């Protein structure tokens, strides 16, 4: 990305609906970590990287 994509976030979402998650580190055009989930219906949603439920959703996918 060329700028931050996430002005607002969700504290989590239904883990069963998640197709993929992109975790973007801070870079030259965005100073904060951004987490964008792509759902099975193709919808995209910004997630809070600091949220414990977000970190647990990633863990459940990583171990599936």
């Amino acid at each position, epitope marked *: 990305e060329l*700028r*931050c*994509q996430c*002005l607002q976030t969700l504290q989590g979402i239904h883990p069963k609906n998640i197709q993929s998650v992109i975790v973007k580190a801070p870079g030259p055009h965005c100073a904060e970590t951004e987490v964008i989930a792509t759902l099975k219906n193709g919808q995209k*949603a910004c997630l809070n990287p600091a949220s414990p439920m977000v970190q647990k959703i990633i863990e459940k996918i990583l171990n599936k």
Partner: antibody
Amino acid sequence: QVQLVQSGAEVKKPGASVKVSCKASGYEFTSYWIHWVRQAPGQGLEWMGNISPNSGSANYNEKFKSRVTMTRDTSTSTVYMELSSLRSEDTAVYYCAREGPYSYYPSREYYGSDLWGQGTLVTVSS
Amino acid sequence: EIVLTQSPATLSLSPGERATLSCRASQSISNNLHWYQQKPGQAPRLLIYYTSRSVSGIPARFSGSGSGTDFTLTISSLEPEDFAVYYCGQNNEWPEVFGGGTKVEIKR
């Protein structure tokens, strides 16, 4: 009223610091990025950086990142820009401007900056 | 960093005439190109966003178009209040960048 109200004019010596405020009213503060843009006398527009009213995380133009800090106060819907190690070339009108609304659903289609503060003149000289 | 180049630097026209202002980007900014008007002692004012989209309360005579890295602001018929400076600004990427401006002057 739907507005961005900035602090008054400033006069500084080289090497000093300046802190300008931009108070937002009449709209959902968390729905819009707030940018800082400056204009030297008789010149064009230059982006300083911006801040997320939600996370309070700022993004800076690399030209200023080492001597600029942007912060936000959720309780008063106010954003601040502190510019340090001031030089005469920083003499300009500094504006704050909002861009949005945006939600948790990202897009690559952006709005322009539709609401601007009245500007704050900062004069830097010996 | 993107460079936005506006042309012409000055446009001298009579009220009633069509004004055509150009903005060219150094590289793709997709359609994330916006146009602003600025009058002396005032902040810039948004006219058109995302190349061609209408802004609430802006008169119909302002319209925008684009193709590739080339953008155009058209004022179909100049009114006396339209003689001012116009800037294009991109926000496809950070830092935002603005063009150098086009001054629309009254020909007499």
